[PDB]
Amino acid sequence: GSAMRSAQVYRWQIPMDAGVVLRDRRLKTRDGLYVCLREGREGWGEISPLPGFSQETWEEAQSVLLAWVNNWLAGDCELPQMPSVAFGVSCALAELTDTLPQAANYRAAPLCNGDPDDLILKLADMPGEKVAKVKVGLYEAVRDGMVVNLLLEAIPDLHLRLDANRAWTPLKGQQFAKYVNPDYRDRIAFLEEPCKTRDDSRAFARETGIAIAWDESLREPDFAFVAEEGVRAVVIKPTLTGSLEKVREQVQAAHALGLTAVISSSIESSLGLTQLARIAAWLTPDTIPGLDTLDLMQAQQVRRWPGSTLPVVEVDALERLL
Ligand SMILES: O=C(O)CCC(=O)c1ccccc1C(=O)O
Ligand SMILES: [Mg+2]
């Protein structure tokens, strides 16, 4: 019957597997925070800004987080605006009020790489809807186009999500596309951020008939959700976006425009990842999310991703700030 508020803040570091790289830079460890709010009821959230993506640092988020909690303890207050903090806190609040739904599915489009032939074998064995993610733009455009074509030709019901991370010039995008049989192009579910500039990405999409998606663009100042020929999806990374409510607004905006919205990982620990999976099952029920990042990390913490065999660090082992 208690309406008594209490809270805890945890600070942590999860070792990454060797060789992880983010935007051509190495990532040794994943630093982050959790918040646990109690009212009589309990809710959790993950506050883990991502170096090189987030504007704020781990340390800054920590400060903002602690201050917000200090306020919440006295009664309801405005959300933080700092995105990682807003996300984690808003999730914790949602759990408290039981407004973040539970989900059946904890799924992710698998991030694929390596030998093309071996990949074919693996894809061939996928059950249900065959959707997979492949990074492009590391090799040269010809190689990427030929390999995508190989994969598409090999498995008629395969749908590939690609990600160029703004790698290409208009010419390189053309060189890539030339190698993909036009009859298969529709099975490129979307190609994230093909070109160096958004204008060029838009030209690519309109000119090649290959669907594109925005990702990084969503976080740039002045971004606007809009219907554009050839734009088929948006990639929403909650941790880099802000509140659960802002996230939901973004999904709604996308849907309103007939775009697919994909909930995507910012390399959160298992805790935040499970929350993303729930957000996805709730808000984007027909779109498998981009959450295949747990396997980059050495351990899970607090909350388990079903099916994972990674070791679990329990709350009692985490550093408490409060
Ligand atoms: O979007 C997903 O499928 C998984 C995560 C992903 O792609 C990503 C995750 C963190 C940082 C950068 C990227 C990326 O877009 O390259
Ligand atoms: Mg991306």
Instruction: Using the structure block, give the residue that is written with the tokens 């973004």.
Output: 250
Neighbours of 261 (CB within 10 A): 25
Paired residues of 283 in beta bridges: none
Phi/psi at 22 (5° precision): -125, 115
Query: 88 phi and psi, to 5 degrees?
Result: -60, -45
Length reported for the chain:
322
Strand spans (E) along 50-129: 111-112
Distances, alpha carbon 110 to alpha carbons 87, 113, 135, 198, in Å: 24, 10, 11, 26
- Choose the residue to mutate in 265, 267, 276 for probing ligand 1, maximizing ligand atoms within 8 Å of C-beta: 265
| Element (DSSP H or E) covering residue 47 | strand 42-47
The pairing of strands 212-214 and 231-236 is parallel
Please choose from 131, 269, 293, 297 the residue to mutate so as to test ligand 1's pocket, defined by most ligand atoms within 8 A of CB. Answer: 293
The two tokens of residue 65 are 């987080």
The atom of ligand 1 lying closest to the CA of 292 is 4
Choose among 188, 194, 245, 232: nearest CA to 216: 194
Experimental method: X-ray
Q: What SS3 class is residue 105?
A: coil
DSSP 264: B
Q: Are strands 159-163 and 319-320 parallel, antiparallel or unpaired?
A: unpaired
Location of structure tokens 């200090």: 70
Q: How many CB atoms lie within 10 A of CB 245?
A: 13
Q: What one-character DSSP code corresponds to residue 169?
A: -
**Which residues contact residue 24 at a Cβ distance below 8 angstroms, ignoring those fewer than 6 apart?**
none
In one letter, which amino acid is 318? L
Q: Among this protein's residues, is 135 annotated catalytic?
A: yes
For residue 49, give every residue at least 6 positions away whose Cβ sits within 8 Å of its Cβ, in sequence order, or none.
Answer: 55, 56, 57, 58, 60, 61, 83, 84, 239
Q: State how far the Cα of 217 lies from the Cα of 140, in Å rounded to an integer.
A: 23
Distance CA 30, CA 25 (A): 14
Helix axes 244-256, 270-283, angle to 10 degrees: 40
- Report residue 251 as tokens: 């999904």
For residue 90 and ligand 1, the question of a CB distance below 6 A is answered with no
How far apart are the C-alpha atoms of 91 and 272, rounded to whole Å?
A: 9
Instruction: Give the pair of three-digit tokens for residue 319.
Output: 């550093």
Q: Rounded to an integer, what distance in angstroms lies between the CA atom of residue 309 and that of residue 295?
A: 10
DSSP one-letter string for 209-228: ---EEESGGGGSTT------
The β-bridge partners of 6 are 38
Helices and strands counted in the chain (H then E): 9, 15
For 124, the 3-state DSSP assignment is helix
For ligand 1, is residue 163 a contact (CB within 6 Å)?
A: yes
Please give the structure tokens belonging to residue 119.
């990949």
Compute the Cα dihedral for 55, 7, 320, 278 and give only its sign: negative
Tell me which residues have their CB within 5 A of the ion that is ligand 2: 163, 192, 215
Buried b (16+ CB within 10 A) or exposed e, 97-124: eeebeebeebbbbbbbeeebeebbeebe
Structure tokens at 60: 């800054």
Q: Helices 170-178 & 141-154, crossing angle to 10 degrees?
A: 30
Domain 1-98+297-322 classified CATH 3.30.450.260? Answer: no
Q: Distance between CA atoms of 262 and 248, rounded to whole angstroms? A: 11
Query: Domain 99-296 in CATH: superfamily?
Result: Enolase-like C-terminal domain (3.20.20.120)
Closest-CA residue, ligand 1 atom 6, reads 265
Main-chain dihedrals φ then ψ at residue 215, nearest 5 degrees: -135, -85
Angle, helices 83-96/270-283, rounded to nearest 10 degrees: 70
Closest residue by Cα to residue 147 from 129, 128, 160, 166: 160
Query: Which residue in 122, 130, 133, 135 is the catalytic one?
Result: 135
DSSP class of residue 322? -
- Cβ partners under 8 Å of residue 287, min gap 6: 260, 261, 262, 263, 280
* Ligand 1 atom nearest to 53, measured from its CA: 11
Q: 21 - beta bridge partners?
A: 26
Q: How far apart are CA 193 and CA 216, in angstroms?
A: 8
Gap between the Cα atoms of 243 and 78, Å rounded: 11
- Cα–Cα nearest to 50, from 297, 265, 222, 248: 265
Whose tokens are 């929403």? That residue is: 236
For 73, residues 6+ apart whose C-beta sits below 8 A from its C-beta are 5, 6, 7
268 lines ligand 1 (CB under 6 A): no
Q: Distance between the two ends of the chain, CA-based, in angstroms?
A: 24
The secondary structure of residue 8, as a DSSP letter, is E
CA distance 68 to 89: 9
What sign does the dihedral 125-149-287-16 (CA atoms) show? positive
CA-based nearest residue to 203, from 224, 181, 172, 225? 172
Q: Which of 302, 248, 298, 247 is nearest to 274 (CA)?
A: 302
Q: 31 has which bridge partners?
A: 13
Amino acid at 73: L
Examine domains 1-98+297-322 and 99-296 and report if their fold is the same. no
> In degrees, to the nearest 5, what angle opens at C-alpha 95 toward C-alphas 301 and 37?
70
| Cα distance between residue 202 and residue 89, in whole Å | 36
Domain residue spans in the chain?
1-98+297-322, 99-296
Q: Give me ligand 2 centre to Cα 161, in Å.
A: 10
The pair of structure tokens assigned to 30 is: 């994943």
Q: Say if residues 205 and 212 touch (Cβ distance below 8 Å).
A: yes
